[PDB]
Amino acid sequence: TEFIRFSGVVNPRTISGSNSVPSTQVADARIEYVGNGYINEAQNMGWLQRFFLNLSPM
Amino acid sequence: NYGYQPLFEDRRPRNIGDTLTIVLQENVSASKSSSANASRDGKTSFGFDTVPRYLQGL
Numbered sequence: 444t445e446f447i448r449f450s451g452v453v454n455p456r457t458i459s460g461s462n463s464v465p466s467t468q469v470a471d472a473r474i475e476y477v478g479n480g481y482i483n484e485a486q487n488m489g490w491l492q493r494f495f496l497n498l499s500p501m
Numbered sequence: 502n503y504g505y506q507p508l509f510e511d512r513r514p515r516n517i518g519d520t521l522t523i524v525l526q527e528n529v530s531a532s533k534s535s536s537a538n539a540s541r542d543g544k545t546s547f548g549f550d551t552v553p554r555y556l557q558g559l
């Protein structure tokens with residue numbers, strides 16, 4: 444599953460025509476596009492590799 | 502809200518809660534160069550390979 448969530452503050456004067464406003468005109472833009480399942484799990488580093496990345500010298 | 506709002510003005514932000522759009526378009530570039538050189542060359546020679554009898558003393 445994919446979750447696309449948006450949050451922000453919109454001035455009720457930049458809304459143009461068909462109730463549409465570009466995200467660049469929204470203050471406090473919070474945009475999340477996350478996924479689940481093994482497809483998302485395959486994009487995680489892995490505990491040992493993450494530890495080496497954060498601690499291993501060079 | 503009971504506040505006064507002009508009709509013909511450009512709707513600039515005026516209060517604490519007002520929102521404004523910022524276009525970064527930042528571009529800075531600085532460069533610096535310097536060089537110096539100094540060359541001196543000298544080379545002197547002198548030789549008879551044949552000396553007159555009267556000059557053999559010197």
Ligand SMILES: CCCCCCCCCCCCCCCC(=O)O[C@H](CCCCCCCCCCC)CC(=O)N[C@H]1[C@@H](OP(=O)(O)O)O[C@H](CO[C@@H]2O[C@H](CO)[C@@H](OP(=O)(O)O)[C@H](OC(=O)C[C@@H](CCCCCCCCCCC)OC(=O)CCCCCCCCCCCCC)[C@H]2NC(=O)C[C@@H](CCCCCCCCCCC)OC(=O)CCCCCCCCCCC)[C@@H](O)[C@@H]1OC(=O)C[C@H](O)CCCCCCCCCCC
Binds near residue numbers: 556557558559
């Ligand atoms: C800015 C201007 C300011 C003014 C500057 C003034 C001049 C500033 C000084 C310039 C002259 C340099 C001095 C060199 C001798 C010296 O003092 O400094 C030596 C160390 C070097 C220091 C120099 C640093 C300077 C620092 C720089 C300073 C610059 C400013 C110590 C030394 O002494 N070392 C020494 C030692 O070595 P060892 O250590 O190992 O033991 O012993 C061995 C063995 O001795 C030899 O044995 C031979 C036999 O075997 C024997 O012959 P034989 O006949 O017997 O057979 C033979 O006898 C003979 O020559 C026989 C006979 C030859 C006659 C032939 C006709 C030549 C005429 C030639 C005519 C010359 C025309 C100019 O003599 C002479 O009448 C010499 C002529 C005198 C001319 C006088 C000028 C009148 C003005 C005439 C004016 C003309 C007007 C137009 C024996 N020769 C000797 O004894 C040595 C000496 C005997 C002295 C007794 C004679 C009366 C001196 C009477 C008075 C002299 C006082 C100065 O003669 C000389 O040269 C003297 C040259 C003087 C020139 C000055 C000019 C002034 C202009 C005046 C200007 C104001 C030598 O080889 C060795 O000397 C050598 O190698 C030298 C080599 O040869 C010659 C190379 C010259 C290249 C140019 C330098 C190039 C160097 C450049 C790099 C630095």
